[PDB]
Design an enzyme around this catalytic site. Structure first.
Site, PDB file in Angstrom:
ATOM      1  CG  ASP A 185      -6.223  -3.844  -3.029  1.00 19.31           C
ATOM      2  OD1 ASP A 185      -5.104  -4.376  -3.259  1.00 19.31           O
ATOM      3  OD2 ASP A 185      -6.409  -2.950  -2.176  1.00 19.31           O
ATOM      4  CB  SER A 208      -0.993  -0.031   1.175  1.00 15.62           C
ATOM      5  OG  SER A 208      -0.699   0.626   2.417  1.00 15.62           O
ATOM      6  CG  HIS A 217      -4.945  -3.033   1.033  1.00 13.04           C
ATOM      7  ND1 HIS A 217      -4.584  -2.461  -0.169  1.00 13.04           N
ATOM      8  CD2 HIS A 217      -4.190  -2.430   1.980  1.00 13.04           C
ATOM      9  CE1 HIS A 217      -3.654  -1.548   0.043  1.00 13.04           C
ATOM     10  NE2 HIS A 217      -3.396  -1.507   1.338  1.00 13.04           N
TER      11      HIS A 217
HETATM   12  C1  LIG Z   1      -1.842   1.365   2.796  1.00 13.10           C
HETATM   13  O1  LIG Z   1      -0.812   1.946   3.591  1.00 13.10           O
HETATM   14  C2  LIG Z   1      -2.465   0.659   4.007  1.00 13.10           C
HETATM   15 CL1  LIG Z   1      -1.658  -0.884   4.563  1.00 13.10          CL
HETATM   16  C3  LIG Z   1      -2.936   2.386   2.459  1.00 13.10           C
HETATM   17  N1  LIG Z   1      -3.435   3.090   3.682  1.00 13.10           N
HETATM   18  C4  LIG Z   1      -2.367   3.387   1.458  1.00 13.10           C
HETATM   19  C5  LIG Z   1      -3.344   4.432   1.037  1.00 13.10           C
HETATM   20  C6  LIG Z   1      -4.619   4.072   0.592  1.00 13.10           C
HETATM   21  C7  LIG Z   1      -5.532   5.047   0.164  1.00 13.10           C
HETATM   22  C8  LIG Z   1      -5.156   6.395   0.185  1.00 13.10           C
HETATM   23  C9  LIG Z   1      -3.893   6.762   0.629  1.00 13.10           C
HETATM   24  C10 LIG Z   1      -2.986   5.781   1.054  1.00 13.10           C
END
Ligand SMILES: *[C@](O)(CCl)[C@@H](N)Cc1ccccc1
Length: 290
Positions: free
Chosen positions: A241, A102, A268
């Site tokens: 996801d 992510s 995810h």
């Molecule tokens: C990943 O870091 C989670 Cl494990 C995710 N939060 C990244 C993200 C998703 C949507 C918008 C910004 C960042």
């Protein structure tokens, strides 16, 4: 077992865990997401050690067990420099494989853009090259949720009432559908989530939750820079996801020769939804690019 330490990188004390051997064929650096989570939820990747893959885990600045730097250093660019400092002051000039989940995926992309010469390969799982785009996609996912939760998200989310139970209930639903499709979440994941809520990085850089980005990365977009990456790249993403395969497709397009794999029935945190399959995919990718 792994070797744990609390060394000083380029200025701050960072906690890292290095799990290596037997028969090391390659080294793999991992970047957890958030921003503001911890390496804890990536521990499932530890299985690759039995495939000759040494895995390095670490808590990014202000994350998990690592100390928090000045507020001005809460940027992706600083994270990249931190990553290179750790790689060098630990593996010297050795070429290593880099994997990011992510936000760590985005971070991995930024790193590659500048330091791909230190890499033998890149792995981006549920990553993104554009926050705005990612937001657009997640907004669609919100509209696709049953009115019961969709309305709660738009109502309380619009009034900044993230403490509301209905809202929180809707958030949880979204998570069990696009973050981790499981009714029994592993301790490792819950721990990283706990760390995200306890520290300040998630709140400042990201926002209230996974789909509400009001933080400093809300406008981050390097889609027009990633085509510069020429090293072997593996892009993975789950069917459900939260950072949709459409976002992954965008990355896939720019990186010539890159691979794109969509995990069916997964979301995810594919490292847990399909641990054996996920580890197998990365392991084969790594081992075929030595
Ligand atoms: C990943 O870091 C989670 Cl494990 C995710 N939060 C990244 C993200 C998703 C949507 C918008 C910004 C960042």
């Amino acid at each position: 077992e792994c070797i744990e330490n609390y060394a000083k990188v380029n200025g701050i004390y960072i906690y890292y865990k290095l799990c290596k051997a037997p028969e090391e064929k390659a080294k793999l650096m991992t970047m957890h997401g958030g921003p503001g989570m911890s390496h804890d939820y990536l521990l499932s990747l530890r299985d690759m050690t039995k495939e000759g893959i040494t895995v390095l885990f670490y808590d990014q600045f202000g994350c998990g067990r690592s100390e928090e730097p000045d507020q001005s250093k809460f940027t992706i660019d600083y994270g990249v420099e931190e990553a290179e400092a750790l790689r060098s002051k630990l593996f010297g000039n050795e070429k290593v494989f880099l994997m990011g989940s992510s936000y760590g995926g985005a971070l991995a992309l930024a790193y590659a853009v500048k330091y791909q010469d230190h890499l033998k390969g890149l792995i981006v799982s549920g990553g993104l090259s554009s926050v705005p785009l990612t937001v657009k996609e997640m907004n669609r996912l919100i509209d696709e949720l049953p009115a019961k939760y969709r309305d709660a998200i738009k109502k309380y989310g619009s009034s900044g009432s993230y403490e509301n139970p209905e809202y929180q209930e809707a958030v949880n639903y979204f998570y069990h559908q696009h973050l981790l499709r499981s009714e029994d979440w592993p301790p490792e994941v819950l721990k990283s989530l706990e760390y995200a809520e306890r520290r300040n990085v998630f709140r400042i850089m990201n926002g209230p939750n996974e789909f509400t980005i009001t933080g400093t990365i809300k406008d981050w977009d390097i889609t027009d820079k990633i085509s510069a990456i020429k090293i072997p790249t593996l892009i993975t993403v789950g069917e459900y996801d939260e950072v949709t395969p459409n976002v992954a497709r965008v990355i896939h397009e720019k990186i010539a020769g890159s691979e794109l794999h969509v995990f069916r029935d997964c979301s995810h945190l594919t490292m847990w939804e399909d641990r054996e399959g996920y580890n197998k995919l990365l392991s084969d990718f790594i081992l075929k690019h030595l």
